[PDB]
């Protein structure tokens, strides 16, 4: 009775099983229920980036607010997906 999720982004990069990929591609057909993937983010307090593990649920998933599909005022020149881990 485990359904699948739906890539909430068309170009999101997460770390599934310690591997960096694009949920919009690897899971182009939605993500499997329970699938755990971390998103890349940055810490203005530590000046480093890290990962936010996520969990796919029966047809529903809650991506970490950290991720920002909207750039608007991203500024800087190193999105979390391309930052060094603290």
In SS3 terms, 11-77 reads as CCEEEECCEEEEHHHHCCCCCECCCEEEEEEEECCCCEEEEEEEEEECCEECCCCCCCCCCCCCCCC
Q: Is the dihedral of CA 13, 19, 25, 27 positive or negative?
A: negative
Distance CA 33, CA 17 (A): 15
What kind of experiment solved this structure? NMR
Distance CA 58, CA 1 (A): 8
Cα-Cα end-to-end distance for the chain: 39
SS3 for 85? strand
Instruction: Please say whether the beta carbons of 49 and 43 come within 8 A.
Output: yes
Q: What residue ranges define each of the domains in the chain, with the CATH number in brackets?
A: 1-86 (2.10.70.10)
Distance CA 39, CA 54 (A): 8
């Amino acid at each position: 009775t485990k359904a699948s999720c739906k890539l909430p982004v068309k170009k999101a990069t997460v770390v599934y099983q310690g591997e960096r990929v694009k949920i919009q591609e690897k899971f182009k057909n939605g993500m499997l229920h329970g699938d755990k993937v971390s998103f890349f983010c940055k810490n203005k307090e530590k000046k480093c980036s890290y990962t936010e593990d996520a969990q796919c649920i029966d047809g529903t998933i809650e991506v970490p607010k950290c991720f920002k599909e909207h750039s608007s005022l991203a500024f800087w020149k190193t999105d979390a997906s391309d930052v060094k881990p603290c």
